[PDB]
């Protein structure tokens, strides 16, 4: 948690945008009221600081870290071998795979505000702290990440 992580938020936003133009759909985390570590204890974490190259090469599909989601703490994301708990409701739009529905589940159960790039839904959408938003502007994502980073 520093200004280096504050700029790493912008770097992660740039990586998510370059994924959105290339449909590299994955899910990430930023803790927002409780630890994800109980759900983040599944695999071999990294705790390496959030860098553009590391995430942009990690969250690609058909590779050793395609499955699951990215879990983070501090200035670092704990690799990718551990996703949060999925949802339990069905009144919301059913227009996505595990990614958007499971991130909204992390909104529903955890207090998270999780950035989750969409392959099944194309763009980037934010579910946050018991609420959500869909397909928002790049400036909205940057402002949200800077505010709740």
């Amino acid at each position: 948690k520093k200004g280096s992580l504050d700029g790493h938020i912008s770097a992660y936003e740039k990586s998510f945008a370059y994924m959105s133009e290339r449909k590299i759909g994955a899910l990430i985390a930023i803790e927002r009221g409780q630890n994800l570590n109980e759900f983040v204890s599944t695999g071999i974490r990294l705790d390496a600081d959030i860098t553009s190259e590391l995430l942009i090469n990690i969250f690609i599909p058909n590779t050793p870290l395609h499955d699951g989601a990215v879990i983070v703490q501090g200035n670092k994301i704990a690799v990718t071998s551990a996703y949060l708990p999925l949802t339990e409701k069905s009144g919301i739009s059913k227009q996505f795979g595990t990614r958007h529905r499971a991130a909204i589940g992390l909104s529903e159960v955890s207090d998270a505000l999780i950035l989750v790039v969409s392959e099944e839904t194309g763009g980037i959408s934010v579910a946050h702290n018991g609420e959500f938003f869909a397909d928002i502007s790049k400036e909205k994502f940057h402002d949200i990440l800077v505010a709740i980073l």
Binding site: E21, R22, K23, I60, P61, N62, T63, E119
Partner: protein, 366 residues
């Protein structure tokens, strides 16, 4: 062939018959044609085989289409079926692939993968012909605002690989195979695909140097992959085509398994399992006349479409059938992928050998 379109796009020799400036023109005017039929900015794809002179035509067409406004994201070195599957999966409005398959290294393909997901529609070809036929180039040339940046799509191998692992339909592990890359479309994704089934892999010609495409390996002289099958002692064979569309293989004995023979094997494994829910499968009269006799003995009804897969796909769309093709090995499982895919055909054959109990020494004997 229209005013400037070939049979499956543009087919010819780069910088010998076709012109690189004409390739940029067929990119730009084609971009205008694509822009004049869809609201919003058209998002397309691009692909090319590993031909030695191939990269020049793809670069010229990518530069030409970059001006018309449709920001063509490009994904070089990938299969044509992979490019089509990515175009129909990620949400593309168009696509491009470049491959010439059975032809020698003196020519390279140019194929505009249409927005439908099948081969390019007639209206798109007519519009591209019109916009390359008129004299003036009246396309809207954006100076700064509206220009389309070239976003590289180097992750295009990953999605096309991911279409194979879903089409595995169970593991192909344990068995021993031979995959002759033939310095073509198999040089990028097919080695990782056949390895991704966790089987013993023996590759031939997987170190392409550009000018080695379709030379002494592949669907032009399959005795080399059979000699490698005999020496390496693997069970089944796999010898891809130039664009990973066609398929052929040698058995554990070394003989030649026909494309219609692979069709009969896949059809028996289908009609036994009930997956081919349109059980009267399509067929081509370009195969041997005894292949239809074998099909009639097998208890599967067959129709006759013209030589080539265009009218085959047309009849598949007309009468709503799932499997049907020529004798080249295009086991186009239309319920599993977009179009002719040699990797998908090899995956289906591996599934047939895995589930049928009997090995490949008994499937082709029908």
């Amino acid at each position: 062939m229209g005013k400037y379109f070939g049979t499956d796009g543009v087919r010819g020799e780069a910088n010998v018959e076709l012109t690189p400036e004409m390739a940029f023109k067929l990119g730009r005017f084609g971009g205008y044609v694509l822009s004049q039929h869809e609201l919003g900015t058209p998002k397309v794809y691009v692909g090319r085989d590993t031909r030695i002179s191939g990269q020049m035509l793809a670069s010229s067409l990518i530069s030409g289409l970059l001006s018309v406004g449709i920001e063509v994201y490009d994904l070089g070195v990938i299969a044509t079926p992979g490019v089509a599957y990515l175009v129909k999966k990620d949400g593309a409005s168009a696509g491009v692939m470049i491959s010439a398959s059975h032809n020698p290294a003196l020519d390279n393909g140019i194929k505009f993968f249409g927005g439908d997901g099948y081969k390019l529609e007639d209206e798109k070809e007519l519009e591209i012909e019109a916009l390359i036929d008129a004299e003036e180039d009246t396309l809207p040339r954006p100076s700064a605002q509206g220009l389309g940046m070239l976003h590289d799509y180097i992750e295009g191998v990953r999605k096309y690989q991911a279409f194979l692992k879903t089409t595995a339909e169970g593991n192909f592990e344990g068995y021993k195979v031979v995959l002759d890359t033939a310095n073509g479309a198999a040089y990028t994704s097919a080695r990782a695909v056949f390895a991704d089934l966790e089987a013993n892999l023996t590759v031939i010609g997987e170190n392409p140097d550009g000018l080695n495409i379709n030379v002494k390996v592949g669907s032009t002289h399959p005795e080399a992959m059979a000699k490698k099958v005999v020496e390496t002692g693997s069970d089944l064979g796999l010898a891809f085509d130039g664009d990973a569309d066609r398929l052929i293989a040698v058995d554990e004995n070394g003989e030649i398994v026909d494309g219609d023979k692979i069709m009969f094997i896949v059809g028996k494994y289908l009609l036994g399992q009930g997956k081919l829910a349109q059980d009267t499968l399509v067929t081509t009269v370009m195969s041997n006349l005894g292949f239809h006799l074998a099909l009639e003995e097998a208890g599967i009804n067959s129709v006759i479409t013209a030589v080539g897969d265009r009218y085959v796909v047309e009849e598949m769309k007309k009468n709503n059938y799932n499997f049907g093709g020529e004798q080249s090995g295009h086991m186009i499982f239309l319920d599993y992928n977009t179009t002719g895919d040699g990797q998908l055909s090899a995956i289906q054959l591996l599934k047939v050998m895995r589930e049928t109990g009997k090995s490949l020494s008994e499937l082709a004997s029908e």
